[PDB]
Amino acid sequence: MEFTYSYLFRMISHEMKQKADQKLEQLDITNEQGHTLGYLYAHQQDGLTQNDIAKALQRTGPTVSNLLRNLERKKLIYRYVDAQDTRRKNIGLTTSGIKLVEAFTSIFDEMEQTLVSQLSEEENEQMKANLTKMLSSLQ
Amino acid sequence: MEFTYSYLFRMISHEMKQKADQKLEQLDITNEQGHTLGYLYAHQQDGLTQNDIAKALQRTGPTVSNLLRNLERKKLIYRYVDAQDTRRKNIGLTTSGIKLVEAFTSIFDEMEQTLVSQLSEEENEQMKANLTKMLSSLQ
């Protein structure tokens, strides 16, 4: 009983996407909001402004601003005085903002771990190398 | 530079589905029509009636009948006297009907071959075994 790669990949992709989507709906955030909060989670130590976020997210002014205004309304982010330079304000995560990205991250992380656990360190390595080769041919 | 399985599987699944869909549109048939013509291609030697097709396709009467009526209108299938029993008529593929399923089959076959070619016989075997194990955990 042998199945095509198409079938197997499609089944796996559908099972994982449904799992991810089912959980994102629970968090009431998008992948755009997730990646935004994520970039903050990762780089807010650098002292981020709206311009920095815009340059990073490849998004326009008011769109970034609407995205930011929505996130601040949900008390997920806040603005604060820069310690190095009091004259300016930076954007940072709230406590609830941090818990959200971590939950957001865990969803994709636990899904990865569940799969990684099934194979050895070399089997995982070989697998990804092979998935990479196949995808590359598909272009 | 390591990507998640989710990403890799999704990319591969999207690349293949777009390729398949792009080609099915060209053939102007569905997967339902394809599998129907396919079942005929495979088992018309047995002498198929509308009831046999219905039992095989898990579809209702007029739905099967509409599916059949559409296929005959497109000159993809025809009805003929059974050789063993002249009193009855069977459903069979036309020449254009045969060429269609073969084209339908080649699309999924060439896509499979392109991928199978990238790995050795044991690498392919190991891969599918592993994809199977991972999907099973995903349930």
Side-chain angles (χ1 to χ4, degrees), chain B residues 76-83 85-103:
Chain B
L76 296 173
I77 66 179
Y78 75 116
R79 315 217 219 92
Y80 64 92
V81 160
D82 191 331
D85 186 28
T86 281
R87 303 136 22 197
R88 55 168 116 107
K89 300 175 60 180
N90 296 323
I91 305 157
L93 284 177
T94 60
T95 298
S96 63
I98 295 175
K99 292 199 175 71
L100 191 55
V101 33
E102 291 174 341

Side-chain angles (χ1 to χ4, degrees), chain A residues 36 39 52-54 56-57 59 64 67-68:
Chain A
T36 307
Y39 173 81
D52 305 325
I53 302 176
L57 255 48
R59 301 280 309 205
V64 162
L67 193 55
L68 258 33

Side-chain angles (χ1 to χ4, degrees), chain B residues 38-44 46-50 52-54 56-57:
Chain B
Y39 173 81
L40 263 48
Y41 186 85
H43 300 141
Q44 73 180 4
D46 308 336
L48 302 177
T49 66
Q50 178 172 300
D52 305 325
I53 302 176
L57 255 48

Side-chain angles (χ1 to χ4, degrees), chain A residues 93-112 114-124 126-138:
Chain A
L93 284 177
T94 60
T95 298
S96 63
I98 295 175
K99 292 199 175 71
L100 191 55
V101 33
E102 290 174 341
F104 174 77
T105 286
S106 69
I107 296 174
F108 294 104
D109 211 80
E110 291 162 302
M111 207 159 302
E112 174 76 4
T114 296
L115 259 24
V116 174
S117 297
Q118 260 68 280
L119 278 70
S120 72
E121 53 175 332
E122 71 164 31
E123 274 186 317
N124 282 281
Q126 177 69 17
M127 165 90 70
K128 293 203 176 198
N130 288 347
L131 293 174
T132 319
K133 189 180 181 186
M134 296 169 112
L135 172 61
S136 194
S137 72
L138 267 23

Side-chain angles (χ1 to χ4, degrees), chain A residues 3 5 9 12-13 15 19 112 118-119 123-124 126-128 130 133-134 137-139, chain B residues 3 5 9 13 15 19 112 118-119 123-124 126-128 130 133-134 137-139:
Chain A
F3 296 86
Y5 281 117
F9 290 140
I12 291 174
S13 282
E15 207 73 16
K19 205 145 303 179
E112 174 76 4
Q118 260 68 280
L119 278 70
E123 274 186 317
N124 282 281
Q126 177 69 17
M127 165 90 70
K128 293 203 176 198
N130 288 347
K133 189 180 181 186
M134 296 169 112
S137 72
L138 267 23
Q139 272 126 1
Chain B
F3 296 86
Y5 281 117
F9 290 140
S13 282
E15 207 73 16
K19 205 145 303 179
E112 174 76 4
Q118 260 68 280
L119 278 70
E123 274 186 317
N124 282 281
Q126 177 69 17
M127 165 90 70
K128 293 203 176 198
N130 288 347
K133 189 180 181 186
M134 296 169 112
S137 72
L138 267 23
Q139 272 126 1

Side-chain angles (χ1 to χ4, degrees), chain B residues 2-9 11-21 23-27 29-31 33-34 36-44 46-50 52-54 56-57 59-69 71-72 76-83 85-112 114-124 126-134:
Chain B
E2 174 176 314
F3 296 86
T4 62
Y5 281 117
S6 174
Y7 173 76
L8 295 172
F9 290 140
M11 290 297 91
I12 291 174
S13 282
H14 182 263
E15 207 73 16
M16 291 177 316
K17 191 212 174 191
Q18 267 203 358
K19 205 145 303 179
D21 290 341
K23 289 195 169 61
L24 287 171
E25 286 270 34
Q26 306 165 181
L27 287 182
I29 62 172
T30 68
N31 288 329
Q33 298 177 245
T36 307
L37 292 175
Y39 173 81
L40 263 48
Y41 186 85
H43 300 141
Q44 73 180 4
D46 308 336
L48 302 177
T49 66
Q50 178 172 300
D52 305 325
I53 302 176
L57 255 48
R59 301 280 309 205
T60 352
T63 41
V64 162
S65 184
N66 286 327
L67 193 55
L68 258 33
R69 136 174 55 256
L71 290 177
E72 186 168 359
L76 296 173
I77 66 179
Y78 75 116
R79 315 217 219 92
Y80 64 92
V81 160
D82 191 331
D85 186 28
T86 281
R87 303 136 22 197
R88 55 168 116 107
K89 300 175 60 180
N90 296 323
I91 305 157
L93 284 177
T94 60
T95 298
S96 63
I98 295 175
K99 292 199 175 71
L100 191 55
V101 33
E102 291 174 341
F104 174 77
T105 286
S106 69
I107 296 173
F108 294 104
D109 211 80
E110 291 162 302
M111 207 159 302
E112 174 76 4
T114 296
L115 259 24
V116 174
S117 297
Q118 260 68 280
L119 278 70
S120 72
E121 53 175 332
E122 71 164 31
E123 274 186 317
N124 282 281
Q126 177 69 17
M127 165 90 70
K128 293 203 176 198
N130 288 347
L131 293 174
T132 319
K133 189 180 181 186
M134 296 169 112

